[PDB]
Amino acid sequence: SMNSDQVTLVGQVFESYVSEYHKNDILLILKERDEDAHYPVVVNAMTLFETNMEIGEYFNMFPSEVLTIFDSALRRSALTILQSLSQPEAVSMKQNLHARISGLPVCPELVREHIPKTKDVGHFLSVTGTVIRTSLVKVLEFERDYMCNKCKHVFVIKADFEQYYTFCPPSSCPSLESCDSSKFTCLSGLSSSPTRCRDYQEIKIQEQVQRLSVGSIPRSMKVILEDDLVDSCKSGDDLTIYGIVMQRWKPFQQDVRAEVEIVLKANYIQVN
Ligand code: NA
Ligand SMILES: [Zn+2]
């Protein structure tokens, strides 16, 4: 992963870029009414990567974690802009901010007309295709709260995207004080204290045979939409999808056969 030295520089370069080129974009988000909704901030990667050389290297190396760092810099930039207003009570802070990457440097390794292959797993790139199928939006739980039997420390576990958002019970207390306790209790179903549930949607895109590069039989691909990306396209649209190539899988069981799948975890959708 990245050490604190690299995480600091990444967030600080992004924070200054946003606070200089997207000041009004954050102001409009702050001016919105619904505080629990998810709001995007769209950024041109090409212009961003030109301000700093290391930011583009870490992004292409650790896209998932760099995007997480970007979201932390958006909340700090939002709170700074909010505190600069003469009447900060006229707007409301928004905690669900997502950095959505658009405009990658145009090159064959990042902008694709074909379905990415196994070699491309883990990389952030764009795929252009046509929507052939959309599913209904589903509400899914992505985090579950637990507590320690010895310290009463409430912690959370993350649903594994690669295993279709399934949870695995831990056996180590992640409290600040080293607890040897392996006994924990599940608090997810006992109450609905938070609404930590996300919108989820699957679409199917296919290569466009009307393209010179696409041969006779086009291939298809599942794209996962989450948060504010759901309901952003319909069957028939021409989409350019920016995101991370990933593998979802289910192991063999007693009577069940295994299945592995290459999908695209969308980060931005551009309708053409
Ligand atoms: Na063709
Ligand atoms: Zn504990």
Offer a quick outline of the entry.
Helices cover 24% and strands 32% of the residues. By secondary structure, the protein is an alpha+beta fold. It folds into 3 domains: 4-102, mini-chromosome maintenance (MCM) complex, chain A, domain 1; 111-137 and 198-271, OB fold (Dihydrolipoamide Acetyltransferase, E2P); 143-195.
Structural features, described:
Belongs to the MCM family. With 272 residues, this protein is of the alpha+beta class. The chain has 3 domains: 4-102, mini-chromosome maintenance (MCM) complex, chain A, domain 1 (2-Layer Sandwich), CATH 3.30.1640; 111-137 and 198-271, OB fold (Dihydrolipoamide Acetyltransferase, E2P) (Beta Barrel); 143-195. The protein is built from 5 helices and 12 strands. The strands form 3 sheets. A 5-stranded mixed β-barrel has the order 4-9-10-12-11. Strand 11 and strand 12 form a beta hairpin. Bound molecules: sodium ion and zinc ion.
Mind telling me the C-alpha Rg?
21 Å
- The side-by-side strand order for the widest beta sheet comes to 4-9-10-12-11
Order of helices and strands: HHEHHHEEEEEEEEEEE
Question: Quick one: CATH superfamily of the largest domain?
Answer: Nucleic acid-binding proteins
> Major beta sheet, specifics?
5 strands, mixed, barrel
Strand residues, percent: 25-35%
- CATH class label of the largest domain: Mainly Beta
Give me the secondary-structure category: alpha+beta
Q: Count the DSSP helices.
A: 5
- What fraction, in percent, of the residue positions are helical? 10-25%
What small molecules accompany the polymer chains? Answer: sodium ion, zinc ion
Organism: Homo sapiens (Human)
Subcellular location: Nucleus; Chromosome
Protein name: DNA helicase MCM9
Family: Belongs to the MCM family.
